[PDB]
């Protein structure tokens, strides 16, 4: 169960290039289940119920309250 | 696992 569970945040809008790789939207919330090489993570969007690959250098991990 | 990606991410823009 390699999942970490971390909420992010989308800095700029991304399409998937490949039938395994999900839509971001400049503002649009996400969760990164966890990170994988190519420099793709696997997130899901808000519903909770789709999940695909999302870029990390258009995203901005979230915290309570760290930087 | 299910997702596998085959490309290199793409980069962000300059302005922001």
Do not use: C
Request: aromatic share 10%; no cysteine; proline share 10%.
């Amino acid at each position: 169960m390699a999942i970490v569970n971390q909420r992010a945040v989308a800095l700029y809008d991304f399409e998937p290039e490949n039938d395994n790789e999900l839509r971001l939207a400049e503002g649009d919330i996400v969760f990164i289940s966890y990170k994988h090489g190519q420099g793709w993570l696997v997130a899901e969007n808000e519903s909770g119920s789709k999940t695909g690959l999302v870029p990390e250098e258009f995203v901005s991990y979230i915290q309570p309250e760290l930087e | 696992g299910k997702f596998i990606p085959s490309r290199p991410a793409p980069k962000p823009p300059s302005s922001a």
